[PDB]
Amino acid sequence: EGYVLHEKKPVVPRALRSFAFKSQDEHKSFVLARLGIFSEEAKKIHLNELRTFAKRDR
C-alpha cells in the first residue's frame, strides 16, 4: 500500500545508543561552546528537546 503507511522507526539497542547519537551530542556541545546560550541555534535545540520530553508522557 505504500512506504508512508508501512514505515516504522527501529528501536536502538541500549548498548548501541552512545554510537547512534554521537554526532548530535557533539553538535550541541559545539554550538554552546562557540555561540553561547543566547543564540538562535541554541534556542532551536531547546525547542526540539521540549518536544521529546512531552512525548514521554503517554
How far is residue 43's CA from residue 45's CA, in Å, rounded to a whole number?
A: 5
Identify the residue whose cell numbers are 554526532.
23
Q: How far is the CB of 35 from RNA (least distance, A)?
A: 10
How far is residue 49's CA from residue 23's CA, in Å, rounded to a whole number?
A: 16
Q: How far is the CB of 24 from RNA (least distance, A)?
A: 4
Mark residues 14-53: x for contact with RNA by CB under 7 A, - for none.
-x-xx-xx--xxx-xxx-xxx--------------x-xx-
3-state secondary structure of 21: coil
Q: How far is the CB of 56 from RNA (least distance, A)?
A: 5
